[PDB]
Amino acid sequence: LRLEDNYVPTSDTLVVFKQLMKLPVTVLYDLTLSWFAKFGGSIYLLTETLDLLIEKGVRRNVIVNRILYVYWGLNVFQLAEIDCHLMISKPEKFKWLPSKALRGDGKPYVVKLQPAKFIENLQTDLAKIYHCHVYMFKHPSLPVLITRIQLFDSNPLISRRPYYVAFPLNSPIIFHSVDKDIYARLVLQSISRTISERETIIFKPVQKIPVKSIHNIMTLLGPSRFAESMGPWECYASANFERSPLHDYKKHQGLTGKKVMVREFDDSFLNDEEPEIRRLRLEKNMIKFKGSASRYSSLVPIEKVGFTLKNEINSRIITIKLKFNGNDIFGGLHELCDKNLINIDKVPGWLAGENGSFSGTIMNGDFQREQ
Amino acid sequence: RLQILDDAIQEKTSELAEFENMVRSPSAGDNAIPGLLQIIQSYINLLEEN
Amino acid sequence: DLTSTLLGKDSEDDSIRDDSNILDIAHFVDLMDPYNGLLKKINKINENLSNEL
Amino acid sequence: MLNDPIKSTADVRLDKEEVLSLLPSLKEYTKKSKELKETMGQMISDSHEEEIKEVFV
Amino acid sequence: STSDRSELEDYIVLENVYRMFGITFFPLVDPIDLKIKDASGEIFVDREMLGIRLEVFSERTSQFEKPHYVLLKKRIKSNSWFLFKHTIPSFIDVQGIFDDTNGGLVISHDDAYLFAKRVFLQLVEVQKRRQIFKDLEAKKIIHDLDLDLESSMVSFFVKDIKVELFVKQNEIVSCSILDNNKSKWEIALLGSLDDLELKLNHSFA
Amino acid sequence: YKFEDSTLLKWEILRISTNVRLKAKQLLATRNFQKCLLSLYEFDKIKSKKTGIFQNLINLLKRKTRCYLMNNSDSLIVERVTIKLQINFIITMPGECFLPMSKISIALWKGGERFNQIDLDEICYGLIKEYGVKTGLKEICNVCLFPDM
Amino acid sequence: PQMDLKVLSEYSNLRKDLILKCQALQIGESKLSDILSQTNSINSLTTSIKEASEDDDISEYFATYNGKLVVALEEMKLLLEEAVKTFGNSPEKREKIKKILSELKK
């Protein structure tokens, strides 16, 4: 009962109209060409009709009436393509949630999957439980694989919410869309069973707070140089400070010297002009909250962060519980420091932005995440 | 797989057989070895005298 | 079994795996070295003995 | 790089005659190595390498 | 400052010839724990930090690649480094290797150098695995192909056949031919990685 | 250098001290100098560790029984009563991983003939796996003594 | 695992055959690596002597090897006789002996 692409579901036409109105004209032309090449309905004779239509500069409404009333829902595969192109177009609408892939002792396992044989295995594992249809494509810019898993029910077939699972190419961290119903656990457990094929893999989730876009979660926790530094160590993730040993020595930071400012270490902040010193103070704040040199937003916007500082004075465990909120936390913190409200001499590393989107405690001066 | 491994082993042992004829030197060097040992004894005597 | 067969109650006739040839090859190639060798060891000594006086 | 042992066969012993007949060129390599070590030992004993190595130091 | 300029230039070129090795230990200090002892106004470092500068040198483009950095910070109550902020991508597992070296605890400098050398061998293996396939492309023996980020799973084209390779550490384990001679051609190309370059001319001549 | 658009064009060798020159003759044709510098440094480190291990073993076994070295330093042979033990330690420079990998094998002699090699290889492999290198060799010469246990 | 008992015996025989197959495969792979290292050392030696001679006379180099060694030790014995009958000192002779020890030692 694994549904093929030629099956058509029963959905409302106006919501597909509303979805397909959120796309440009050339992707609609590509979609019409691919659907007529694969399925058709009502060769190259009908192609010049749309070639002449897009040359005249028509609106999107007449061409979306064309696509919705030469096929009259279209099918399950066409809906999957529409929704996946909508995911490619506007990435700010979704919400990802990462999860690691452990095996055996606890060593991480790179997935290294192939898009061909994985799809039929996932479908023949899921079809023994529910009605299902999967669809897997490659992101055109970022090197990830986005898999759209859709499920159905019988009161003909009432659709469910489509569930996304994003595989990066060479990382043991697998993103899935944020859900907590029994279908989400079923799909994630089925993928954890069918991706292995030699030795068993489990999916311990590494985070509990969702993050917004796929570029952000890819830069945070995918295969990238920014995967761990992420904060004041952002200079080491781009290497803009050193050159190769085969470079010139005349243009070297050892020979040229960088303009620096003498720090203050006495308590000279609670007792409160020269625009070069003002520019150096803004450069110091830019160094501490970011890399070397809009204008407040960081590399990645982080939604929610909750810290915990468990210090120890005279054998007393003194806990505090910082919590944050908003659109971009560390950018707003850099803005608040830029207005001379936070003494940047005493801002620790975990507050500064490193180990971003990780809400964990601190036990004697070294960060550790929370389960 | 064992057949192609045996073919590679046969190729390498034919290379070894081609090398093994370049080192055979039928000579009467045992008298030359005795002369070398006698000159070594003379050099040891001259070193012990030094 | 080894401590039994040493004192109370092996041999080698066929070799499916051994190590007694590669070090012989190594001794041969350090004997026949035209760079450091033993014949070139003498060739530096008499050059040094000619420079000794 | 240790001399790695053979994988576990679950009480199937290493029948050296059967796997030696399975790779018949290994006997040719064995006799070639025996002839090579014979010729190299004849070259070594004629050169008095151990003799001049032991008489010096 | 002319003689001191020449001395600093000699120091910089000495840093360059040491950095051409690949594994260097540059000193570092975390700017938050620069505590003042308040005995003379001087500044002592509370927690020491030692930065490793891994740098793989290519051969095809004949230039140094982007260097990966590993940073180690000493713990506050154990006198042993723990891996603070590394920049290696996550297909090369770093935390498990740091737990595996010397039983988890790393005290001396050469104990860290062993871990740096292991990660360096992994990085150079990945770099050579990318370079050999890129030069096989540049020699035009193969058609257009796709590479992974670690060059462990590639898929190229020959004159008729689509070929998939899944390669382990510098030697090929799983192959795929897709389009009884196919099985012989499948097992024949299995082996080393330069053996693939030799055996591709054995079937495309 | 290219010194801008940083590229290495030419590199070569001026002079080598004639001690590793034959061993370096295979490695110095790969035209990858980073492997050359690291392989020379790792060879120096491995050779120093090998001669330290052999000096430790000779300083601990020079009292009870006899001992002598071999070909250059690659193998060590001790004897007792007769019974002989040969330990091999071969450093292989790479050619056609790239670090110089070492090989350790042992061999025994009961006076009459050599023992079997499979059981001795398995025993020395397991003993090095379980004890170590500086401790495993002391255990293997103690078990080839076998005066008491 | 291991186990109409004739097809059971045939299955156990085929299982023992495949076990012997993979055993011989591992043995042949390790032995082929050893042979490849040995012939790599041999090729390094032959290329080194071909670079040193530059005349393609490797067989004449091996055949006249003992002649070169015997004229070398003849020159060494004449030099030792000259050092015994010419220097006759306690500092220069000891320095020459230490230089010979440092040269022929390693």
Can you give chain A as a three-state secondary structure string?
A: CCCCCCCCCCCCHHHHHHHHCCCCHHHHHHHHHHHHHHCCCCCCCCHHHHHHHHHCCCCHHHHHHHHHCCCCCCCHHHHHHHHHHHHHHCCCCCCEEEEECEECCCEECCCCCCHHHHHHHHHHHHCCCCCEEEEEEECCCCCEEEEEEEEEECCCCEECCCEEEEEECCCCEEEEECCCCHHHHHHHHHHHHHCCCCCCCECCCCCCCCECCHHHHHHHHCCCHHHCCCCHHHHCCCCCCCCCCCCCCCCCHHHHCCCCCCCCCCCCCCCCCCHHHHHHHHHHHHHHHCCCCCCCCCCCCCCCCECEEEEEECCEEEEECCECCCCCHHHHHHHHHHCCCCCHHHCCHHHHCCCCCCCCEEECCCECCCC
Counting every residue, how long is chain B?
50
Max CA separation in chain G (angstroms): 97
Phi/psi of residue F27, each to 5°? -85, -30
Which residues lie below 8 Å from residue A255, measured CB to CB, with a gap of 6+?
Answer: A249, E5, E8, E9, E12
| Minimum CA–CA partner of F129 in chain D | D2
Angle separating helix axes D25-47 and D49-56, nearest 10 degrees:
50
State whether residue C31 sits within 8 Å of chain G by CB: no
Residues of E in contact with B4 (CB under 8 A): 187-188
Angle at A307 between CA A302 and CA A308, to 5 degrees: 175
Cα E142 from chain centroid (whole Å):
26
Three-state secondary-structure class, residue E191: strand
* H or E, element range at F6: none
Residues belonging to chain C: 53
Closest-CA residue of chain F to D3: F121
Q: Cβ of C43 under 8 Å from any chain G Cβ?
A: yes
Residues of chain F found within 8 Å of residue A244, distances taken between Cβ atoms: 6
In angstroms, rounded to a whole number, what is the distance separating the alpha carbons of residues A357 and B39?
83
- Cα–Cα nearest to A337, from A293, A277, A290: A290
Residue of A nearest to F9 (CA): A246
Structure tokens at A139: 């992101």
The angle subtended at Cα G45 by Cα G43 and Cα G47, nearest 5°, is 65
Which residues in chain E are followed by a discontinuity, with C-to-N distance exceeding 2.5 angstroms?
Answer: 179
Which of F15, F16, F18 is the mutation pick for testing C, counting most C CBs within 10 A?
Answer: F18
Q: Which two tokens stand for residue A206?
A: 């590494």
A63-92 burial string, b = 16+ CB within 10 Å, else e? bbebbbeebebbbbbbbbbbbbbbbbeebe
Q: Is A315 on the interface with E (CB under 8 A)?
A: no
Q: With contacts defined as CB-CB under 8 Å, which chain E residues touch A252?
A: 12
Between the alpha carbon of residue D52 and those of residues A234, B29, E44, G63, G105, the distances in Å are 65, 16, 62, 20, 11
Instruction: Give A-chain residues touching E67 at CB under 8 angstroms.
Output: 239, 242
D neighbour chains, 3+ CB pairs within 8 Å: B, C, F, G
Spatial neighbors of A190 by CB under 8 A, at least 6 apart, are A122, A125, A126, A129
Q: Which residues contact G38 (CB under 8 A, 6 or more apart)?
A: B16, C21, C22, C25
DSSP C1-53: -HHHHHH--------SS--TTHHHHHHHHHHT-SSSSSHHHHHHHHHHHHTT-
Task: Kindly report the backbone phi and psi dihedral angles of residue F20, in degrees, each rounded to the nearest multiple of 5, phi listed first.
Answer: -130, 10
Distance (Å, whole) CA G73 – CA G77: 6
Give the tokens for residue A98: 């990462």
User: How is residue E44 written in tokens?
Assistant: 């002592």
Start-to-end CA span in chain D (Å): 34
Enumerate the residues of chain E whose CB falls inside 8 A of the CB of residue F34. 20-22, 56-57
Tokens of A361: 């405690």
- Tokens representing E170 are 């510098």
Which residues in chain D are closer than 8 Å to B39, comparing Cβ atoms?
Answer: none
Interchain contact, C49 vs G103, CB within 8 Å:
no
Q: How far is CA F10 from CA E67, F1, F14, G15, in A?
A: 23, 8, 13, 58
**Nearest-by-CA chain E residue for A247:** E16
Tokens 């590399």 -> residue: A299
Q: Which of D19, D43, D46 sits opposite G23 (nearest CB)?
A: D19
Report d(CA E85, CA C35) in Å as an integer. 49
Q: Return the residue in D22, D26, D27, D29 with the most chain B beta carbons within 10 A, the one to mutate for interface testing.
A: D29
Please give the angle made by the CA atoms of A75, A78 and A79, to the nearest 5 degrees.
85
Say whether F143 and C2 touch across the interface (CB within 8 A).
Answer: yes
**What's the rounded Cα separation, in Å, for the pair E51 and A311?**
27
- F-chain residues within 8 Å CB-CB of D2? 103-104, 125, 128-129
DSSP SS3 for E103: helix
What is the C-alpha separation between F134 and F136, in angstroms, rounded? Answer: 6
F102 touches chain G (CB under 8 A): no
The answer to whether the CB atoms of G20 and D15 lie below 8 A apart is yes
Specify the DSSP element, H or E, that contains F149. none
Best probe of the C interface among D4, D25, D37, by most C CBs < 10 A, is D37
The Cα–Cα gap between A171 and F6 comes to 32
Burial of E72 (0-12, 13-18, 19+ CB in 10 A): buried
- Taking residue C46's Cβ as centre, other Cβ atoms within 10 Å add up to 18
How many Cα atoms sit within 13 Å of A102 on the Cβ side?
10
Contact E85 A236 (CB under 8 A): yes
**Do residues G73 and F55 touch, judged by C-beta distance below 8 A?**
no
Strands E162-168 and A361-363: unpaired
Tokens for A274?
């020269």
Residue recorded with tokens 């062993």: E114
Find tokens 């809906």 and name the residue. A79
Query: What are the structure tokens assigned to A334, written together?
Result: 């850099």
Chain G closest-CA separation from residue D19 CA (Å)? 6
Are D6 and G101 an interchain contact pair (Cβ–Cβ within 8 Å)?
no
E146 phi, psi to nearest 5 deg:
-120, 140
Closest residue by Cα to residue A205 from A358, A91, A363:
A358
Asked if the C-beta of B25 comes within 8 angstroms of chain G's C-beta atoms, the answer is yes
* Breaks (C–N over 2.5 Å) after residues, chain A: 42, 72, 155, 272, 293
Report the distance separating Cα B35 and Cα B28, nearest Å: 12
Resolution (A): 4.2
Cα gap E63→F2, rounded to integer Å: 10
d(CA F50, CA A101): 41
**D2 vs F118: CB contact, 8 Å cut-off?**
no
Which candidate, F117, E122, B15, places its Cα nearest to that of A110?
E122
Å between D3 CA and nearest CA of chain F: 6
Q: Is G77 helix (H, G, I), strand (E, B) or coil?
A: helix
Longest dimension (CA), chain D: 56
DSSP-H helix ranges across G54-64: 58-63
Nearest by CB to residue E121, choosing from F6, F7, F99, is F99
Cβ distance of F125 and D1 shorter than 8 Å: no
List of chains touching E (3+ CB pairs within 8 A) = A, B, F
Judge: B27–G66 Cβ closer than 8 Å, yes or no: yes
The first and second tokens of residue C12, run together, are: 């080698």
Give Cα E154 to chain centroid, integer Å. 19
Chain A touches chain E, with at least 3 Cβ pairs below 8 Å, answer: yes
Q: What is the DSSP code (8-state) at residue F100?
A: -
